[PDB]
């Protein structure tokens, strides 16, 4: 469902003997290729920004800032992990390059091909192309009737 760990029990046991195509799951947190010099932050989570671009969202002032799924010109970073008990979203700033599986829009998902340029929408989902350097490294993988993921590399903002 709408959780990093699928919110449904599994009827069967440990049943994978092949080593190929076993990482295409929604619980695959972090990045496929990760450096030891990466800068990682955590913020209070407003909703479910997991595997989505996040933006800084402020309230009245009584409580600290939080992060919510967003993009466009308000994009701050990418949420690569979430802790449910503490409601904490792990964010990699846009100044740090990221390579991993990110949520993709269910509108033209069949049109996404490797090498295509992508950008974040208002919900923080990737979509085919304007101001953020994002390139799809693979095709769309369907995990649920409304859930699609794509291997993308993000390497900062873009001119104009």
């Amino acid at each position: 469902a709408l959780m990093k760990n699928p919110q449904q029990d599994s009827g069967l046991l440990s049943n994978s003997i092949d080593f190929r195509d076993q990482n295409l799951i929604f619980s695959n947190s972090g990045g496929v290729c990760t450096s030891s010099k990466d800068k990682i932050e955590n913020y209070p989570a407003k909703g479910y920004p997991y595997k989505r671009g996040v933006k800084l969202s402020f309230g009245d002032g009584t409580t600290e800032l939080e992060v919510e799924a967003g993009g466009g010109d308000d994009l701050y970073g990418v949420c690569s992990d979430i802790d449910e008990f503490s409601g904490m979203a792990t964010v990699i700033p846009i100044t740090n390059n990221f390579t991993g599986y990110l949520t993709l829009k269910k509108d033209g998902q069949n049109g996404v091909n490797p090498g295509d340029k992508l950008n974040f929408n208002q919900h923080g989902e990737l979509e085919k192309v304007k101001s953020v350097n994002a390139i799809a490294l693979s095709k769309a993988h369907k995990l649920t009737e409304d859930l699609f993921i794509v291997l993308a590399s993000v390497f900062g903002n873009r001119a104009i």
């Binding site: 990466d38 390059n97 490294l137 390497f155 001119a159």
Partner: protein
């Protein structure tokens, strides 16, 4: 090549310690931080000391000399045996000597990466500032010390 494997009959006169660092084989950067991110990628061609771009075609994507809107990083070292290039992502600060298109780049000039991955005077999608004059090291190879710090809006 980074280090041309040629056996000579004489030792090159290199006793003076001044003006001894502007060489093609001097890989890496003049100033380096422990927390600089380095990525090794397969390469095609000779992208040494040049801006690189990813190319996807069956084999995994590689990198090759390029520039402009397709820039992905800068190649600072090459291992020929494994055919692998070390790349600093464009989101990371860099300072060192890179390939210049011609001997027309002076100090303080703003520079752009061209189609061949060489630096030329300015349109600029990145922030690059020349710190030294263009210096010839080979038949037509020019090296210039440049500080590259991120992208440039508009």
């Amino acid at each position: 090549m980074k280090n041309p494997q040629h056996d000579a009959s004489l030792l090159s006169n290199s006793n003076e310690f001044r003006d001894k660092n502007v060489e093609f084989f001097a890989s890496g950067g003049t100033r380096t931080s422990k927390f600089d991110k380095l990525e090794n990628h397969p390469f095609l061609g000779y992208p040494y000391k040049r801006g690189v771009k990813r190319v996807i075609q069956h084999y995994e994507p590689h990198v090759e000399a390029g520039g402009g809107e397709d820039l992905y990083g800068i190649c600072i070292d090459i291992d020929e045996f494994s055919k692998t290039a070390t790349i600093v992502p464009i989101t990371n600060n860099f300072e060192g000597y890179l390939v210049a298109k011609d001997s027309t780049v002076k100090v303080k000039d703003k520079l752009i990466f061209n189609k061949d991955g060489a630096l030329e005077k300015v349109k600029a999608t990145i922030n690059a500032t020349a710190l030294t004059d263009a210096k010839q090291i080979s038949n037509e190879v020019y090296l210039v010390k440049v500080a590259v710090f991120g992208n440039k809006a508009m």
